[PDB]
Paper text:
The crystal structure of the phosphate-bound [name] was used to solve the structures of the apo and arsenite-bound forms of the protein by molecular replacement. Figure 5 shows the [name] ligand-binding site with arsenite forming a link to the sulphur atom of Cys106, confirming the role of this residue in arsenite binding. While the majority of both structures overlay very well, there is a significant difference in the rotamer conformation of Tyr88. The change in the side chain conformation is further associated with the backbone shift for residues 83–88 and a significant conformational change in the loop region comprising residues 53–61, demarked by the black circle in Fig. 5A. Interestingly, while the structures of apo-[name] and the phosphate-bound [name] contained a monomer in the asymmetric unit, the arsenite-bound molecule crystallised with six molecules in the asymmetric unit of the unit cell. Although the six molecules were arranged as the three repeats of a loosely associated dimer none of the interfaces is sufficiently large to be indicative of a biologically significant assembly. The arsenite-bound crystal structure of [name] showed significant conformational changes compared with the apo and phosphate-bound structures, specifically in the loop of residues 53–61 and the shape, as well as electrostatic potential, of the protein surface. It is possible that these modifications allow its interaction with the sensor histidine kinase, AioS, leading to its activation. [name] and ArxX bound arsenite with a Kd of 177 and 311 nM, respectively and no interaction was detected with any of the other substrates tested (data not shown).
Numbering used by the authors: 45 to 304
Write the structure that this text describes.
Amino acid sequence: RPGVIRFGLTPVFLSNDLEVLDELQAYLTQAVGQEVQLITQRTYQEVTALLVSGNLEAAWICGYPFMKFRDELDLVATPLWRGKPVYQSYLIVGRDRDIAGFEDCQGDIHAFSDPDSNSGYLVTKTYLAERGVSEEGFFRKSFFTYGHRNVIRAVASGLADSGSVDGYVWEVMKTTEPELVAKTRVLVKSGWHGFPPVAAAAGQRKSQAVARIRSALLDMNQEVLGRSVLTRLQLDGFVETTAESYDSIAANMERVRRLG
């Protein structure tokens, strides 16, 4: 009862599903006792600012923002998806597009998710950097959709010739929106990276709320609601991890910088 908790969301899952946004708020307030409010922004960077500055108690964010601000944030918990707390980046093209590999997308109009996304930018940036080109040199046009669901839409609709997307989001939409997703196919799958975690500011790690929150996430599979929420997100639940999960990502950040 003491007040109001601010919990941040990013489109690292289907945050358009208002139904889930509801159940989720429900499970959290019960588990935490106080009223929890879910926050969203237009971009990742915006959420990341609010989180670093402690304006949000915690937030569900991509692995890339977490490592970029590694020092100013700590892990709370990481989703489990199909057994393991990991995911891939999918480079997607049109279903009927006849092409072999990445190199054939030269000259595409390309949809990225967010300049701060691992699966929606960084991974593909790496593929470019290893070939000594940038997006402006390799693609005839590129743009940010500010969300993974949106990348898939862009490709499916024909607005983009190819796209870079969170593979979890793609595999979930393959079942919740199968006709859309069926207008795309996966051209390249990355290696496995740490699943987008929940996290909080480091100079407020020793906090009641985080602990209250860290708890809510691990025990989610133990409530009736929390089990409904998980079913919706197609996740097994949340586990504790350390920064070492996210090394694959930091090493890509390093490859991009060193290759530039």
